[PDB]
Amino acid sequence: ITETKGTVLIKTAEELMNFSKGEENLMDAQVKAIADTGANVVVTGGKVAD
Amino acid sequence: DGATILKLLEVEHPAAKVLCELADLQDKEVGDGTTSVVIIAAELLKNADELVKQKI
Amino acid sequence: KVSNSGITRVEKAKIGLIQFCLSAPKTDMDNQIVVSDYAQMDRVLREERAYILNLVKQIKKTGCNVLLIQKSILRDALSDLALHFLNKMKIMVIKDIEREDIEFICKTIGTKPVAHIDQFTADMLGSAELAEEVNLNGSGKLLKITGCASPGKT
Amino acid sequence: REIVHIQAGQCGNQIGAKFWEVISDEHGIDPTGTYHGDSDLQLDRISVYYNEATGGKYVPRAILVDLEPGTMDSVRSGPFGQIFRPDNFVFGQSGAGNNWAKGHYTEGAELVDSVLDVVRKEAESCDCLQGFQLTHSLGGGTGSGMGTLLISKIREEYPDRIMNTFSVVPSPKVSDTVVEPYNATLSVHQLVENTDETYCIDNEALYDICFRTLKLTTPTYGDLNHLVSATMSGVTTCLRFPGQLNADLRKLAVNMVPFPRLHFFMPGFAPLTSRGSQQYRALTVPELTQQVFDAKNMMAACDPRHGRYLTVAAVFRGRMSMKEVDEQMLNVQNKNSSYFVEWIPNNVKTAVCDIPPRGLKMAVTFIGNSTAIQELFKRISEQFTAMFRRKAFLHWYTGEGMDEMEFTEAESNMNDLVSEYQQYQDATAEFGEEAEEEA
Amino acid sequence: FANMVVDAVLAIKYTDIRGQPRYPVNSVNILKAHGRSQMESMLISGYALNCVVGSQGMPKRIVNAKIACLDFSLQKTKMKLGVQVVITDPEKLDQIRQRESDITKERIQKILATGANVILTTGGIDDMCLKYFVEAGAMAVRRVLKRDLKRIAKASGATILSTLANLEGEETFEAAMLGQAEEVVQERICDDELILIKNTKARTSASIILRGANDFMCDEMER
Amino acid sequence: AAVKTLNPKAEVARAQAALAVNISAARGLQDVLRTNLGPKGTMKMLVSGAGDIKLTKDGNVLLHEMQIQHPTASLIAKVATAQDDITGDGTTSNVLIIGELLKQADLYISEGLHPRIITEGFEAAKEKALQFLEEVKVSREMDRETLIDVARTSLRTKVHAELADVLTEAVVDSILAIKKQDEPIDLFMIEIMEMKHKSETDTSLIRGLVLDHGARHPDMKKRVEDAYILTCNVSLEYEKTEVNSGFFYKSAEEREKLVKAERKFIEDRVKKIIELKRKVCGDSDKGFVVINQKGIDPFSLDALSKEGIVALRRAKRRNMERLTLACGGVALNSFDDLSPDCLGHAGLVYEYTLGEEKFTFIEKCNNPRSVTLLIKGPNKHTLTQIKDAVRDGLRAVKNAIDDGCVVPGAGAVEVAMAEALIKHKPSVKGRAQLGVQAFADALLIIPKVLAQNSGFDLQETLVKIQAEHSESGQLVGVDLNTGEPMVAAEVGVWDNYCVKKQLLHSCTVIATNILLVDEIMRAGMSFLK
Amino acid sequence: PVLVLSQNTKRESGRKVQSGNINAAKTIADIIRTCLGPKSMMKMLLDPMGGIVMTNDGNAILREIQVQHPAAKSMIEISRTQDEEVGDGTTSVIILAGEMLSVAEHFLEQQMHPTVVISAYRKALDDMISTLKKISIPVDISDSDMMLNIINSSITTKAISRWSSLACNIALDAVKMVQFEENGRKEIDIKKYARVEKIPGGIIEDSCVLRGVMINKDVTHPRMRRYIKNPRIVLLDSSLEYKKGESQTDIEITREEDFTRILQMEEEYIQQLCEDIIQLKPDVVITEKGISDLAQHYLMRANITAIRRVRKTDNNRIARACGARIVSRPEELREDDVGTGAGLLEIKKIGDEYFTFITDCKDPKACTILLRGASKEILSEVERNLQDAMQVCRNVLLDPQLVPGGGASEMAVAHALTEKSKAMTGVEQWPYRAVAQALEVIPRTLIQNCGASTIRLLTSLRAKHTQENCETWGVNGETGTLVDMKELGIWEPLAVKLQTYKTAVETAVLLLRIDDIVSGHKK
Ligand SMILES: Nc1ncnc2c1ncn2[C@@H]1O[C@H](COP(=O)(O)OP(=O)(O)O)[C@@H](O)[C@H]1O
Ligand SMILES: Nc1ncnc2c1ncn2[C@@H]1O[C@H](COP(=O)(O)OP(=O)(O)O)[C@@H](O)[C@H]1O
Ligand SMILES: [Mg+2]
Ligand SMILES: [Mg+2]
Ligand SMILES: [Mg+2]
C-alpha cells in the first residue's frame, strides 16, 4: 500500500461488488509468478497475510 | 481616602459590613465626603443606644 | 443595555419583536462550503454581505425603529456586520431578551412574536410614545418604555 | 519509520526514565536487554523505538541532556540505567540557575554543538526516520532556554520531519520560581512557529487526581510521573502495535490540527479512580467513556462548559466485541451534543488495540482540542504584564546579553495567540462613563 | 492644581437637550509617570495615548494629521470556519494562496488613497501589513483600547468603523469620514514613550500627566 | 550592624574581615595548584559522582573538576577559562601569580598601610614590566625546526617523555599542511578522531579525512583504488508534500499504479547520478563515491549498489567543507546542474571495522588543505589526556606563527623583570615604592616553584640565578636536572609572547579589584524560588 | 466559636510609627554612604543564581537587597527613578534623603505638627532651584576639549578612571553619532541603537567603537564569500521557504501525475523568489527566518551571501547603519530599499567562534561598542560605568548648563538660604534653616572618605563662602584641601543637580505624612 495515507473510494454499485474479487485475483497472479521461476521456499522478515 | 481604606480591609461582622458599603455608596452617588458619612453613622448608633438602655 | 452605539432616545417608536437570527445562513444538517477555484473566494464574501443586507432592508421597509432580539445559544444572534448596517439606518437595537418573559413583554406592549422574515409586516408592530434608556447616578443604566397606545393589564 | 526521543532538564529526565520503564515490561524486554516474550505480536514493531545490537540485545533510542551531573547520575545509577547507551549521556558541570538567558545564550550555546553530533549518530542507524519527541518543562531554565535553542537548531538541520513534544504547563497557583512568567512566555513564542503540536499537562490536576479521587494525602512527585507516564504510553501506544488502519504521526497532524497555529491539545486517561472505586465501580463501556467529558479527568485549568471543543479523538485498549464500543459511542456523541463543536461535527476518531496496558482490566485514552485553553494563556499574560511594568528582576535577563525588546516582542504574540482562540467562540464578544450623546 | 482642574472641566463642557449642559468627567485621561517634581506635571490640550508606534522605520511626527479610526484587525485573510478548501487540479493552488495575502493589500490601498496619515486600530496588524504604511509614510498603532478610540473619534470628528461595506455590495472609504488634528507627536517621558494628539478641531479634549517621586506617590495624586 | 536590622537572615563580612576571607581563600587555590608547574609536576586523579576516572595535569581542567564552593574561588576560575579559550596555555601560572600577589600586598597592609597606596604601585610596576618585555623578545623566521622547539616545550609538560616525541611532529606538520600564505590559520579543519585500539604510541597524522561511519548496504565494495568524490546535501529520502494530501483510488489495480508513481520524484534524482557515473567512469576501472549529508532510503541504496557506487548518508555539517578543500569538488544542493567539473578526486578509499563501530578513510589527496589527527589508546581516560595535550600544542604553535616573536622561558624572563623593576623603584615617589617592591617578589614565584618541585632549595638556588644575570648580561634560567644556571635560548626552551603579555595584564587587574573590596554581603533572596 | 472584627490584621499608631520610619530610612543610608567620592571602595554582592556583582554603583547595591519594612521600600524605589531619569547621582540622592529626614525628628519631639514642617520643606525647595539656576554656567557644545572634561569629571569616580582618556572618546563618539533629526523637528538621542558587546580576553586597550555593527553569525554555506569590499545589501523579513497557508486546505489526488507535479511546484515557487531578489543585483542578503537548502543553491549561483535568523533588534540597527530598509515581500523589492552605505564586510574568528563585521559606513546612525578584558565580572562593571558616561553626555546636549562639583554648589545654596531665612518671621523659620543645613552632608562625606578632619575643613569652608565672590570653592577629594573648582576643573550637568534636590525633598514629604500601619490583610 502507499506510504502516504490512502483510502479506497467507491461511487457506484459495481465498484462496491468488484473490489473484493479484484484484490484476490491480483494476489493469485503475484504468487504464481513467483512459483514460475521454481522457488520452493519463501523466507520473509515481516508479517504474512492470510 | 476613606472609601479606599475600608474597601481594602477584611471585615466579617455584619454590623460593620453595612458601614463599608455605606462609604462605597457615597463614592458612586457623589464622590466626596466618604469619611464624614462613616463618622456620622457610627455616632448616631452610639448616641441612640444609651437612649434604648433607658426604657425607651 | 442597548448594543447600538449612538442612539439612546426614540420618539413615536414602533417596536418589533424577532425570534430569528441575523447571521450567516445555517442549516440544521451538517453543511459545509467547498472551494476549488480562486474566483470563489470573492463570491463568498460578496454573497454573505448581500444576504445580511437583504434582511435589514426588509425591516426598515416597515418603519421599525426599535428591535428586540431573543437569546440563542446554538447560533449567533447578532453579527458585527448586521449591527453596522442597523446603525446606518437609525434603528435602536436591544439584544438577549430572556425566553421565559416573552409572554410578559407581549402582554405589556401588544406586539406579536415573529419567527420568519416573510411574516415581518406592519401588522405585527406595537406603538409607544417614548423609548429611552436612563442612566442612574452611579448604580448603572436602565431602560424605560412609556406611553403604550394599546396597553395590556400589567 | 523511526522515531527518536529526547529529554532535557529536571522534569523531562524523570518522565523519560519512567517511560522507558513502562515500555520494557510490556514488550518482553528485561533490565539486561534480552527479549523474554513468547508472543510474536510484541516483536513485530519492536524496532520503532529500539535498536538491535548483535547478540539479541535491544537498546532505546533516547538522548538524555542536562547541565548538571546530579540528575543524570541518579538515572544512570538508578533502575534501568544499565540498559541505556553509554555515550548517550550528555552532562555539563555547572547547571543553568533557571535564568532563561543563561540557558538560551551562555551555556546552551557551547553544549548543542556536542549534542547535535549524538543525534546524528542515532539518525544514521535508521533507514528512514519519521520524527522526534521532546520532553521538557516550562519552568526550569534548561527546559525553556536550552529547549528553545535545541528546537531552532533542529528545524534548520531537518527540513520537514515532524516535531512532537510533551511539555508540562506551569500552574501559577503553584508559582514556585518567583520569576516564573518570564520563562513561560518566551518559550511558547518560539513553540508556536516551530512545532506541529504540543501536549500540555499541569501539576495541579496531577495533584488532584491522586490526592482527592484516590488516596495518599501526601502524593510525592514519584507518583506524579506514573500518572503522566500512563498518558505517555497512550498517545504513543498505537504506534508500537499493529492496527487495521495504519495511523502514523503525520496523519495525526492533518486529522487533528485544522489550523497550523491552534495546535495545543490536552489529553485524558479514564480508568483510574479510588482503589475501592477501582473495584466497586462497574467498569463498563459507557461509564468508562463517561469520564471523557467529565470535569475531573481533565488535566488543564480550562472550564469546558465555558468553551467549545474543536476535535476529539478516542483510543481504546482491550479485547472487546466491536458492537458495544460503537453503540455507546453513538450514544455519547448525541447525549451531550449540546455543548459540542460549532462547525466541525463528527470529530470522533476511534482506535482499538487488542493488548491493553499491563496491569488493569480496562483502559482508554482521549485527546481533545479546546477553545478554553485561552483561559490558561490569558492568565499567564496578565501576570506577565503586571511584572514588566515594574521591571522587576529584569537585570538578571537584560544583563546577560539579551535586549529588552524581546520581552515586549514576546508579549505581542501572546496577545495575538489569545485573540485567535477568542475569535472562534463568538460568545465572549458579549461601561462606566456617561458619554451616550447624539452620535 | 486648582487652575489645572477647572480648565480641564471647562474643556469638556457638553451642550445637550433643550438647555441642559453636561460635564462628563472621567472622559479626561489621567496618566502617571515618575520622574520630575509634581509642580512640572503638565496639562495637554488634546489627547494622550499610552501606546507606541507599531514599527521603528515608520515616521514619528506628523504636522497635519488625517486620522482614520478602525475597529478590525489588518492581517492576512482566511476563510471562515464553515468554508473548506478542496483541490483536485494542482494548477489552481498558486492563485489560491495569493488571494489570502492580496485581499488585505487592496483594503490598505483604499484607505491610503484618500490621504490618511495616522491609522488607529483596536485589533492587531500583521508584520506584512506594516510595510505598506512604511513606504507611504504613514503612522499606525495596534492594540488600542476601545474607550480611548471612542473619545478620539468624538474629539477629532472621525467615525469608528467595524467594517467597510456600504448600502450596496462593494466596499468604499470616502473622505468625509476622516478625523483632523493639528499635530501627532510621540514623546519621551522617563525612559518610555507615548503618543500625543494636539488641537483636535471637531471638539476640545484634555488629558493630564502627573509626575512624582515614585509610583506610590504618583498613585496618590491620581486618587 | 546596619544591615542586620533590615534583613536579619543576611550574611556579611566587613572591612578587615572581607580582606581576610579573600586573601586566605586565594592562597588555598595556590597550595594545591603549585604542584602542577613544570614537567616534574604530579598527576592528580579525579572521580565524579558516577564513578568515572579522569587523570589530568592541566590548570583549567583541575579548576572546574575540584569540589569547591567559594565566591572568591569563582572570580579566579572565570578568569582562568578566559585565558584558556583565547591563548590556549598558561592557566596554572595565572593562579600562582594572583595568590602570590595578594600575599605580598597583605604583608605591608597588616602594618597599617592603606590598600590604595599599594594599588598605585602595581600600575607603575605593570607599565614598566610591559616595556621591558618588548625588548627581550626574539624575532625569527618561524622555520620548521624552531616550531619544533616551541611545540616540544608545550607538549613535554603534559605527557611522558617518549610520547611527546611523537605528538610534536604531528602537531607541527598538521599546521604547516593547512597553512596558506598571510591568510590566518583557520582551525576546525584539523579533525581530531579517537580510536580505542592498540597502544598509545600509534597516534599518527593522515593526509586526508576519516569518517566515523561507512557503507550500510551489504554488497557495497570495501575498498576503492581510484575514486571520484561527490559531495552533496540533497535528500534521496522519501518525502511528502508540505500541503496535506491523500491518495484516493478505486480498486486494486489503480492502487498499484499510485504506489509506483509516488517514487518518481526520488527515482529521478538517483538516475541523474547514475547517468553521470556512466559518462566519466566509462570503463570498470575507476571508482565512484557519494557522500551525502542527508538520509538514503533502502530503495535508493539498492539502485546505487547495482552500479558499484559507494554511498554514505548523514555526514556532519563541518565535513561539508573539509572534503571540499581536501579532495577538490563542490558542495552542491541540487542535481539540476550536475556536470563533471564538480567532482572531486581521491586516491584511496577503504573501510575499517572496530567491533560495533566502523570507519572510512579518505587518503592520498593531491594537495590537501585539511588533515586529520588520529588518536589511539587502550583506555578512555588516556584518550582524553592525549586530546587535551593536542589542543594546547596547536594553540602554542599557531600563536608563534601569528606573532613574529618568541620569548625564552624556563624561568629566565621573570628574573629579568625582577632585576629591572628594582632599579626603577628609587625613581618613584611616596609610599608607592612599596607597591613596586611587592610586584617584584610576585614575579619570583615562577622560578621558586620550578626549583621547589624538582627537589632543590628555594633560597640557595634563586640567589645563584640572581648571581648570574647581574655580572653577565645574558638571559639565564633554571636547569631541572642540575640546579645550575642555564642559558634559555641555547638549549631550546621557549615561550609564546602573547601568553606573557596577557598573563601580566590579567593578573594585575584582578588583584587590583580584589584588594579594593569593602565588604562581602549576601542580603538578597536566598534562592530563586 | 470565637468573635472577631478584623480577622488577623495587625495595627500600629502613635509616635512609635513616625520614629519607626525615620530609623528605617537612616539605616539604608548607612549601607551606601561608603561608596561616594574618588576614594570609594567596592562591594561584592551575591545573587540567587550564584553570580557575583562586584560594583560601586549606588543603584546596583540596592537592587540586590530584600527588605520587608514598608518604609525601606520607598528608599529603594526612588533609587531607580533617578537612574532611569538622568542615569547619574543614585548615591547623593539617598544620602540627602536620609539627612533631610533625620533633621526633622528634632521638631517632632517638640510637639510640632507635621503639616507645619511639610509647608516649610516645599517652600525651601523653590529657593533651592532659583539659586541653582543663578550660578549656572553656559557651555559651548562645539568645543570638543570642553566636552571631554565633562565626561572625565563623571568617570574619575569609577574603575575605568585608569583608562579615562580612552573612555571619554568612546562615550563621546557614540553619542555624537546616534544623534538623529527626522521628519518634522523631533531631535532624539535614543540609546537602543548603541549596542554594547563583551568578549572576554585580550586587553582593555583593545576596545574600540566601530562605524557600523557586529553580528554573532556566519555564512550558511561555506562556498559563499567572506570578504567583500562594497556590498549592496538587502534586508528581508519573511522566510525563503515554501510554508503552509492557513485557510483549512487539503489536496485530493486521483492521477499518477498529480503527486510529482505538486512536489515540482514547490521548487518552482522558490525559484520565483530567488530570481526576483537577483533582479536587484545585491551582494549580501540578511533575513529574519530560515533559508531553504534550495534557496541557498540559487543564491550561491549568483554570488550572493546570506545570513539566517538575525534578531529583530539587530536588523533595526543594520537598517539604520547601511541605509537600507526591511522589505517583507520580494515582489515589492525596489532600488530605494537597497543599502549602499557600507564600506566593508568581514568575518573573523575570535577564539574558536565566528563574527560578522559591517564597518566603514559612509554615515552610520548606529554603532556597536566592542569591549575586551579579563573576565565577565570586570566587563560587567565596565559597561555599567560606560552607560553612566553616555547618559551624562546626553544631558549636556539637551540642556547646556554646568554647575561646580565637589560640594561647592551645596555650600553656595546653603549660604543663600540661610541669609534669606532671617527675613522670615514665624515658627516656619526653624525648619527652613535645618533643611538648608542638611545639604552639608555632601562635602562631609567626601572629607571622611579622604581621611581628613571633618571638623576643621568644614568650618573653614563655611567661613570661606561667607565672603562675596567665592561661590566656586569646593573640597578636593584626593588630598583634603579647599581648592577652587575653576582650576581643578570639576563640573556636572545642571539637570543632575535639579533632579537630586527635587527627588530628595519630595520623598521626605511622603514619609512625614504617615500616622499608622495596617498589615497582613491578605488582599
Ligand atoms: N624543559 C623545561 N625546562 C625548564 N622549564 C620548562 C621546561 N618546559 C616547560 N618549562 C616551564 O614550565 C612553565 C609552565 O608551563 P606548563 O607546565 O605548560 O603550565 P602553564 O603553561 O599553564 O604555566 C613555563 O613557564 C615554562 O617556562
Ligand atoms: N575629583 C573630585 N573631587 C571632589 N569631588 C568629586 C570629584 N569627582 C567627583 N566628585 C563628587 O562626587 C559626587 C558624586 O559622584 P559619585 O561618586 O559618582 O556619586 P553619584 O554620582 O552616585 O552621586 C559629585 O557631587 C561630585 O561633586
Ligand atoms: Mg474626603
Ligand atoms: Mg602548557
Ligand atoms: Mg556622578
Short mmCIF file of N, CA and C in Angstrom, two decimals, chain A residues 12-49:
data_model
loop_
_atom_site.label_atom_id
_atom_site.label_comp_id
_atom_site.label_asym_id
_atom_site.label_seq_id
_atom_site.Cartn_x
_atom_site.Cartn_y
_atom_site.Cartn_z
N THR A 12 -20.33 3.77 -7.17
CA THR A 12 -21.42 3.06 -7.83
C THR A 12 -21.52 1.65 -7.24
N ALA A 13 -22.60 0.97 -7.62
CA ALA A 13 -22.84 -0.38 -7.10
C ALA A 13 -21.79 -1.36 -7.60
N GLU A 14 -21.40 -1.26 -8.88
CA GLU A 14 -20.47 -2.22 -9.45
C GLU A 14 -19.12 -2.17 -8.75
N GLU A 15 -18.62 -0.97 -8.46
CA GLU A 15 -17.31 -0.85 -7.83
C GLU A 15 -17.31 -1.45 -6.44
N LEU A 16 -18.43 -1.35 -5.72
CA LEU A 16 -18.51 -1.97 -4.41
C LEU A 16 -18.41 -3.49 -4.51
N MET A 17 -19.07 -4.09 -5.50
CA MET A 17 -19.07 -5.54 -5.61
C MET A 17 -17.77 -6.07 -6.19
N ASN A 18 -17.15 -5.33 -7.11
CA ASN A 18 -15.98 -5.82 -7.83
C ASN A 18 -14.67 -5.54 -7.12
N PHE A 19 -14.69 -4.85 -5.99
CA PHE A 19 -13.44 -4.55 -5.29
C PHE A 19 -12.83 -5.81 -4.69
N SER A 20 -13.64 -6.59 -3.98
CA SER A 20 -13.12 -7.75 -3.28
C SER A 20 -12.61 -8.82 -4.24
N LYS A 21 -13.35 -9.06 -5.33
CA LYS A 21 -12.89 -10.02 -6.33
C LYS A 21 -11.59 -9.58 -6.97
N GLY A 22 -11.47 -8.28 -7.27
CA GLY A 22 -10.28 -7.79 -7.94
C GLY A 22 -9.02 -7.97 -7.11
N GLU A 23 -9.11 -7.71 -5.81
CA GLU A 23 -7.94 -7.81 -4.95
C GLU A 23 -7.42 -9.25 -4.89
N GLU A 24 -8.32 -10.22 -4.78
CA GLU A 24 -7.90 -11.61 -4.67
C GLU A 24 -7.22 -12.10 -5.94
N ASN A 25 -7.75 -11.71 -7.10
CA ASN A 25 -7.16 -12.16 -8.36
C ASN A 25 -5.74 -11.64 -8.51
N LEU A 26 -5.50 -10.39 -8.12
CA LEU A 26 -4.17 -9.81 -8.22
C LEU A 26 -3.17 -10.59 -7.36
N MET A 27 -3.60 -11.00 -6.16
CA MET A 27 -2.71 -11.72 -5.27
C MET A 27 -2.36 -13.10 -5.83
N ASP A 28 -3.31 -13.75 -6.49
CA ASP A 28 -3.05 -15.07 -7.04
C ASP A 28 -1.96 -15.02 -8.11
N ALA A 29 -2.02 -14.02 -8.99
CA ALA A 29 -1.03 -13.92 -10.06
C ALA A 29 0.36 -13.66 -9.51
N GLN A 30 0.47 -12.81 -8.48
CA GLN A 30 1.78 -12.48 -7.93
C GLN A 30 2.47 -13.71 -7.36
N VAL A 31 1.73 -14.54 -6.63
CA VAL A 31 2.32 -15.74 -6.06
C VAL A 31 2.64 -16.75 -7.15
N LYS A 32 1.76 -16.88 -8.14
CA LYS A 32 2.01 -17.81 -9.24
C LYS A 32 3.24 -17.39 -10.04
N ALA A 33 3.44 -16.08 -10.21
CA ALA A 33 4.63 -15.61 -10.91
C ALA A 33 5.89 -15.99 -10.15
N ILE A 34 5.85 -15.92 -8.82
CA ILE A 34 6.99 -16.35 -8.01
C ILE A 34 7.25 -17.83 -8.23
N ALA A 35 6.20 -18.65 -8.18
CA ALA A 35 6.35 -20.08 -8.36
C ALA A 35 6.77 -20.45 -9.77
N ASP A 36 6.61 -19.53 -10.73
CA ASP A 36 7.01 -19.82 -12.10
C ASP A 36 8.52 -19.92 -12.26
N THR A 37 9.28 -19.20 -11.44
CA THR A 37 10.74 -19.28 -11.51
C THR A 37 11.29 -20.55 -10.89
N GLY A 38 10.50 -21.25 -10.08
CA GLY A 38 10.93 -22.50 -9.48
C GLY A 38 11.24 -22.44 -8.00
N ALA A 39 10.90 -21.36 -7.30
CA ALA A 39 11.19 -21.27 -5.88
C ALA A 39 10.41 -22.32 -5.10
N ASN A 40 11.07 -22.96 -4.15
CA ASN A 40 10.43 -23.97 -3.31
C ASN A 40 10.11 -23.46 -1.91
N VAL A 41 10.87 -22.49 -1.40
CA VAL A 41 10.67 -21.96 -0.06
C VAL A 41 10.79 -20.44 -0.11
N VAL A 42 9.92 -19.78 0.64
CA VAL A 42 9.92 -18.33 0.74
C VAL A 42 10.19 -17.94 2.19
N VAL A 43 11.17 -17.06 2.38
CA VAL A 43 11.53 -16.56 3.70
C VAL A 43 11.35 -15.05 3.70
N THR A 44 10.65 -14.54 4.71
CA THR A 44 10.36 -13.12 4.80
C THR A 44 10.73 -12.62 6.18
N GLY A 45 11.01 -11.33 6.26
CA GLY A 45 11.40 -10.72 7.52
C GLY A 45 10.27 -9.96 8.18
N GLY A 46 9.04 -10.21 7.75
CA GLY A 46 7.92 -9.48 8.30
C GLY A 46 6.62 -10.25 8.37
N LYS A 47 5.52 -9.51 8.57
CA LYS A 47 4.20 -10.10 8.69
C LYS A 47 3.79 -10.77 7.38
N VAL A 48 3.01 -11.84 7.50
CA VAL A 48 2.44 -12.53 6.36
C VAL A 48 0.92 -12.40 6.41
N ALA A 49 0.29 -12.45 5.25
CA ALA A 49 -1.15 -12.33 5.13
C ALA A 49 -1.80 -13.70 5.05
#
